[PDB]
Amino acid sequence: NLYFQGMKKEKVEQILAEFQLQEEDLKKVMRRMQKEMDRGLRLETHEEASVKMLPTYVRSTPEGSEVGDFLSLDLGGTNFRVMLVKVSVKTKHQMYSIPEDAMTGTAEMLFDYISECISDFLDKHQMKHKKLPLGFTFSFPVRHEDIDKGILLNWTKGFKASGAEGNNVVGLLRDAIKRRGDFEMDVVAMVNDTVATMISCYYEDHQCEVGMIVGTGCNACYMEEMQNVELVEGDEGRMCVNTEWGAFGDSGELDEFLLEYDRLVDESSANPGQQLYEKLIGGKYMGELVRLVLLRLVDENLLFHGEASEQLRTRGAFETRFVSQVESDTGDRKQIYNILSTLGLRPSTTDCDIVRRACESVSTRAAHMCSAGLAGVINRMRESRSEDVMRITVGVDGSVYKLHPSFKERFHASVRRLTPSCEITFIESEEGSGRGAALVSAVACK
Numbered sequence: 001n002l003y004f005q006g007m008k009k010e011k012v013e014q015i016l017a018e019f020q021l022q023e024e025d026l027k028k029v030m031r032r033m034q035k036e037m038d039r040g041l042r043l044e045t046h047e048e049a050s051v052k053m054l055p056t057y058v059r060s061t062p063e064g065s066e067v068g069d070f071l072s073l074d075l076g077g078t079n080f081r082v083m084l085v086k087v088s089v090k091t092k093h094q095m096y097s098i099p100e101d102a103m104t105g106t107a108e109m110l111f112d113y114i115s116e117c118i119s120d121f122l123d124k125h126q127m128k129h130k131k132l133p134l135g136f137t138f139s140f141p142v143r144h145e146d147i148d149k150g151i152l153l154n155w156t157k158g159f160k161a162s163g164a165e166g167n168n169v170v171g172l173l174r175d176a177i178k179r180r181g182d183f184e185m186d187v188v189a190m191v192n193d194t195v196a197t198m199i200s201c202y203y204e205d206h207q208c209e210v211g212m213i214v215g216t217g218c219n220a221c222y223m224e225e226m227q228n229v230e231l232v233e234g235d236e237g238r239m240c241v242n243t244e245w246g247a248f249g250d251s252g253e254l255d256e257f258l259l260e261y262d263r264l265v266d267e268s269s270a271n272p273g274q275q276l277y278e279k280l281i282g283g284k285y286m287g288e289l290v291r292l293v294l295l296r297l298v299d300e301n302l303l304f305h306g307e308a309s310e311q312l313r314t315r316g317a318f319e320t321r322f323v324s325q326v327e328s329d330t331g332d333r334k335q336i337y338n339i340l341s342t343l344g345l346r347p348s349t350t351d352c353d354i355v356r357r358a359c360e361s362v363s364t365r366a367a368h369m370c371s372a373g374l375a376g377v378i379n380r381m382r383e384s385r386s387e388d389v390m391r392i393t394v395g396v397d398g399s400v401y402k403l404h405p406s407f408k409e410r411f412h413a414s415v416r417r418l419t420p421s422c423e424i425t426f427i428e429s430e431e432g433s434g435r436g437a438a439l440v441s442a443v444a445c446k
């Protein structure tokens with residue numbers, strides 16, 4: 001019965017319409033983000049600011065860098081990456097899966113693991129004896145005192161290792177290295193992944209002064225005028241600021257836009273009440289948002305005969321990669337069918353179409369919300385600079401931006417609508433977070 005199949009779809013659409021954000025909604029978000037950014041930069045309001053605008057101590061500096069071998073560490077997904085880079089060739093690269101116990105255990109365990117992975121890598125390439133300059137991409141909010149010293153403000157993205165928050169991260173790393181005592185490293189720089197991504201792209205294209213990650217988490221950094229970074233002495237040149245925009249909304253700034261699914265995701269997360277804007281966008285949460293929408297549709301007898309399988313009712317079962325796979329479906333529904341069948345469902349073609357619409361609704365909202373953030377930053381920059389038309393390059397990494405079949409296109413379109421009088425070039429970084437840490441280390445070394 002097509003009429004009834006059709007009636008189901010119309011009811012689904014009414015439910016999914018909740019995810020829509022009009023252009024004026026996005027402008028509001030953008031303005032509110034810019035407001036929060038202003039607040040993070042100012043001494044008077046930094047402590048209260050949800051968007052921390054953390055100085056990175058990465059500065060505009062004359063051309064050039066030290067040459068040779070640099071080790072780069074990259075922590076901030078569940079995979080830890082070690083990279084040898086010769087200044088530039090990524091001579092060698094190894095990725096290591098972080099055990100469950102290390103991400104939610106003690107900082108000692110986490111950093112012991114990291115140190116072990118480093119010895120493994122140094123062994124695979126017979127260079128454990130060589131004392132190397134090391135750049136550390138550490139993808140969490142850090143309050144820096146310098147390029148090589150900064151305290152972890154709080155874990156995000158489900159990290160929970162005790163004894164890390166409030167401590168110098170470079171010290172934690174150094175301590176773990178010393179405890180193992182089988183190699184030595186000169187940790188010269190610690191940067192955020194947004195920062196590393198920007199640096200890696202900047203190397204290729206000097207117009208790159210913004211980095212953005214849309215991966216497990218979502219964040220951005222940009223080159224701010226020193227005169228605007230009240231938290232650091234000096235008015236000359238530029239310094240990269242790590243926005244930590246994922247925490248936008250943590251003070252209520254997004255309340256009118258948060259849906260029931262968002263509340264649910266937030267409440268089941270490792271950091272309830274935190275990173276709310278990130279929870280609208282990041283790959284850690286996207287598949288779960290879809291899962292909750294699907295459960296709602298099942299509850300309304302709109303999907304899967306009103307029955308959800310064990311798998312569909314399993315936390316994290318609807319993987320963000322499935323959202324990407326569903327929206328990649330060519331129209332034969334074959335990809336969608338296979339995902340849902342593996343989730344223990346017996347989907348009809350209508351079921352498949354509805355799941356497609358759910359995915360599109362969540363991912364479009366993610367794209368649009370993300371666009372308001374980036375537009376806020378770029379518009380801010382254009383204003384801070386003398387600029388009628390600002391031509392700028394944004395370096396981007398992260399599986400959501402890179403792998404989702406239509407996120408990038410929706411995101412770009414929306415950003416462009418919100419940034420007239422800007423000309424934004426987007427570059428997808430290759431090795432960005434790893435390569436960027438080595439590059440910053442080479443510059444920090446000179």
Ligand SMILES: CS(=O)(=O)c1ccc([C@@H](C[C@H]2CCC(=O)C2)C(=O)Nc2cnccn2)cc1Cl
Pocket residue numbers: 057058059060061062063064065147189198199200202203204208209223238439440441443444
């Ligand atoms: C000429 S360069 O490509 O070697 C280069 C120089 C400058 C820098 C800066 C960071 C860039 C990023 C965007 C921007 O406008 C400046 C750098 O490495 N700065 C730095 C490094 N260490 C300590 C303090 N500052 C990086 C790089 Cl790869």
Ligand SMILES: OC[C@H]1O[C@H](O)[C@H](O)[C@@H](O)[C@@H]1O
Pocket residue numbers: 076138139140141156157192193194213215216217218219220244246278
């Ligand atoms: O990994 C992308 C982002 O994830 C989270 O938002 C982290 O707090 C931030 O530091 C990082 O840049």
